[PDB]
């Protein structure tokens, strides 16, 4: 319809516990 | 919203025949129902559309239209061709807007030379 032409710390965050997904309701 | 659509279109019959009955109606009663006569209210543009259509009834009053089946197709293809022509006018405008963007962003605005220090909408027509 209308298509016309013309014409870095990787192991650290697992140790510190970051990027572990967790939620407050 | 039946009341608004009725109070626009009832006076739109009376405005289309005289234009003086409603100018007498607004001063006698003095009500908030006829606020649409002034252009401040948004419905006055839509009220402008009704009375233009009511006057087109008054034009050929006493004249019959006789467009035949060949002719009605002949008219709408002519209507279609205007819709394409209105479209290509939009496209050339859109390209030249893009043309103005490229030259605006790519000219030096730091090449100064000053000299001194310190209604147009009708003037954008031709007469």
């Amino acid at each position: 319809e209308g298509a016309e032409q013309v014409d870095m710390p990787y192991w650290l965050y697992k140790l510190h516990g970051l990027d572990r997904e967790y939620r407050c309701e | 919203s039946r009341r608004d659509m009725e109070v626009i279109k009832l006076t739109a019959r009376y405005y289309a025949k005289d234009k003086s009955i409603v100018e007498q109606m607004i001063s006698k009663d003095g009500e908030a129902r006829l606020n649409f006569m002034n252009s401040s209210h948004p419905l006055h543009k839509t009220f402008t559309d009704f009375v233009a259509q009511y006057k087109r009834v008054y034009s050929f009053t006493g004249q019959e239209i006789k467009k035949s089946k060949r002719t009605i197709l002949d008219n709408c293809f002519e209507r279609t061709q205007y819709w394409e022509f209105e479209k290509d006018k939009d496209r050339e405008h859109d390209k030249l807007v893009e043309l103005c963007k490229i030259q605006f962003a790519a000219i030096p605005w730091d090449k100064f030379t000053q000299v001194a220090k310190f209604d147009l909408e009708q003037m954008r027509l031709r007469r």
Binding site: - | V7, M25, C76
Partner: protein, 144 residues
């Protein structure tokens, strides 16, 4: 008041003219295939350029080619549009002060508590005659 009837008849004639021209916009072949056959029947009728036929364009833009079933469907759909167009036209030909203003406006004060939006006059007529009016969004081109 016959004046509302004459306006509402002319508006319905305007929508049908705005309806079928949307089809001839989306499919130029509807008018083009037609005017080929009338030309061998009524030889006076002027048909557009041969380039406009084969490239399937009207002013500048080439549309996408349609199969025969979708064209002939719209050719019978515009047919019942033209029958509606002529039926309204026939009745329209067969139909076509300060105190009387205020007498009706007091009668317009009747039934004040009508808590209901009414945008169904110009919209239910336009959606009736426009493309793809039967499905939810887009399954069948046929109008209501």
């Amino acid at each position: 008041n016959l004046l509302e009837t004459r306006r509402s008849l002319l508006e319905e004639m305007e929508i049908i003219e705005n309806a079928i021209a949307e089809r001839i916009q989306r499919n130029p072949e509807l008018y083009y295939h037609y005017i080929q056959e009338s030309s061998k029947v009524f030889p006076d009728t002027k048909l557009p350029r041969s380039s406009l036929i084969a490239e399937n364009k009207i002013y500048k833009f080439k549309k996408v080619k349609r199969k025969r079933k979708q064209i002939i469907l719209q050719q019978h759909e515009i047919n019942i549009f033209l029958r509606d167009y002529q039926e309204k036209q026939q009745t329209f030909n067969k139909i076509n002060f300060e105190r009387k203003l205020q007498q009706l406006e007091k009668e317009l004060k009747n039934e004040d508590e009508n808590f209901e939006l009414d945008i169904n006059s110009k919209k239910d007529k336009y959606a009736l005659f426009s493309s793809s009016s039967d499905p939810s969004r887009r399954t069948n081109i046929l109008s209501d």
